[PDB]
Copies of this chain bind each other. A is one copy, B any other.
Amino acid sequence: EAYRKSQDTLHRFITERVVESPSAETVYNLSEVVTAYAEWYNANINVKRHIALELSQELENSVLEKYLQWSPNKTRILKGCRILHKFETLQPGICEPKNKWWEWSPNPS
């Protein structure tokens, strides 16, 4: 589980740079958030090719899914959340081995 959580790069970007902000909603389109994830991945993880189509559905399943409303153009938009820049900050709004272990059974035999 720890290894899987470590491999979840999108969740790491979201928890490190994406925050909810009722004070400054600053509605972003989905492509903007995708490009922000792409440059974060290139600058923090590895310079690699990025596909916005995939990242749309990955982002539509992460902890941000609840914030994805519909634009007047019926386009996917991240509502009520702020993408933090390089220095922006959060603001208001064992078992026993003493014997022959090869014969060990679980506590319920």
Contacts and interface: CB of A to CB of B under 8 A. Distances in A.
Interface string A34-75: 010000000111110101110000000000000000011111
A63 B7 CA distance: 26
Main secondary structure of the interface of A (DSSP, over half): loop
Interface of A: 15-16, 29, 31, 35, 43-47, 49, 51-53, 71-75, 84, 86, 89-90
Contact of A71 (B29, B45, B89): B89
A44 B31 contact: yes
9 contacts: A15-B74, A31-B44, A45-B51, A45-B53, A46-B52, A46-B53, A47-B49, A72-B89, A73-B89
Contacts of A72: 89-90
A31 B51 contact: no
Contacts of A49: 47
Given A29-B86, A86-B29, A16 B46 contact: no
Contacts of A89: 71-73
